[PDB]
Amino acid sequence: MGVTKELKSPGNGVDFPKKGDFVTIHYTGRLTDGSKFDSSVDRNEPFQTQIGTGRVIKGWDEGVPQMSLGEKAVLTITPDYGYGARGFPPVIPGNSTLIFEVELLGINNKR
Ligand SMILES: C=CC[C@@H]1/C=C(\C)C[C@H](C)C[C@H](OC)[C@H]2O[C@@](O)(C(=O)C(=O)N3CCCC[C@H]3C(=O)O[C@H](/C(C)=C/[C@@H]3CC[C@@H](O)[C@H](OC)C3)[C@H](C)[C@@H](O)C/C1=N/NC(C)=O)[C@H](C)C[C@@H]2OC
């Protein structure tokens, strides 16, 4: 529904994030017009977040637990599961579909 996932490279197929876990992710975020609005890869800084607890947009909270540890995937996120009608000024317009390349590098202490 609000997020769908295309697998690019498989993870270990065994370890999946659960609600409340902390995950480490490398990502690149783009608009559908091609604009890159952010990239942890470009700043060489893996991004850590608790998953499933609303600290990140819903598309991440729902999509990331579907990935196995080590997986590279692309999340396509509808506005309802992203920043909605307001967007995120100044970088994400209202009603933006978001495209995230995501690599699941760690779950809690597992790498
Ligand atoms: C003072 C606070 C700053 C504080 C910033 C940091 C700790 C730095 C951290 C690395 C954020 C990134 O800095 C390079 C940027 O990430 C993006 O570039 C990105 O790629 C992007 O979309 N994301 C980053 C990677 C994961 C997916 C997604 C995300 O969910 O991000 C969290 C966020 C903005 C949550 C909103 C929470 C509000 C609520 O209304 C909304 O519901 C709809 C959701 C974000 C991790 C938040 O938890 C922490 C912060 N937030 N600023 C807030 C809350 O205003 C977005 C577009 C903008 C972010 O810089 C402003």
Residue numbers in the entry: 1 to 111
Task: Quote the study's own text.
FKBP12 proteins are members of the FKBP PPIase (peptidyl-prolyl isomerase) superfamily and catalyze the cis-trans isomerization of proline imidic peptide bonds. The immunosuppressants first bind to their respective immunophilins, FKBP12 (12-kDa FK506 binding protein) and CypA (cyclophilin A), which subsequently bind to calcineurin in a groove between the CnA and CnB subunits. The immunophilin-immunosuppressant complexes inhibit calcineurin serine-threonine phosphatase activity, blocking the dephosphorylation of downstream targets, such as the human nuclear transcription factor NFAT (nuclear factor of activated T cells), involved in T-cell activation and interleukin-2 transcription, and the fungal transcription factor Crz1 (NFAT homolog), implicated in virulence, stress response, and thermotolerance. To this end, we characterized high-resolution structures of the Mucor circinelloides FKBP12 bound to FK506 and of the Aspergillus fumigatus, M. circinelloides, and human FKBP12 proteins bound to the FK506 analog APX879, which exhibits enhanced selectivity for fungal pathogens.
Previous crystal structures of AfFKBP12 bound to FK506 required a Pro90Gly mutation in order to trap the ligand in the binding cavity. Without this mutation, an apo homodimer was captured that is hypothesized to result from a self-catalysis mechanism involving the Pro89-Pro90 motif. Here, we obtained crystals of AfFKBP12 bound to APX879 without the requirement for a P90G mutation by the addition of APX879 during purification. Our AfFKBP12-APX879 crystal structure further emphasizes that the Pro90 cis conformation might modulate the binding cavity volume. In the AfFKBP12-APX879 crystal structure, two protein monomers bound to APX879 were resolved, one showing the acetohydrazine moiety in the same orientation as the FK506-C22 ketone (C21-C22 dihedral angle of 68°) and the other showing a 90° rotation of the acetohydrazine moiety with a C21-C22 dihedral angle of −44°. This suggests conformational flexibility that might be restrained upon calcineurin binding. The affinity for APX879 was reduced by ∼40-fold for hFKBP12 and McFKBP12 (KD, ∼120 nM) and 100-fold for AfFKBP12 (KD = 462 ± 23 nM). The binding stoichiometry for hFKBP12 and McFKBP12 was 1:1, while for AfFKBP12, a stoichiometry of 2:1 (ligand-FKBP12) was obtained for both FK506 and APX879 binding. This could be due to the displacement of a sparsely populated low-affinity homodimer or a shift in the Pro90 cis/trans equilibrium triggered by FK506/APX879 binding. Contrastingly, the Cα-RMSF (atomic positions in the MD simulation fitted to the crystal structures) highlighted areas of the proteins and ligands exhibiting conformational differences. Both fungal FKBP12 proteins when bound to APX879 showed high RMSF deviations for residues 52 to 55 not observed for the hFKBP12-APX879 complex nor for any of the FK506-bound counterparts, suggestive of altered conformational states for these residues.
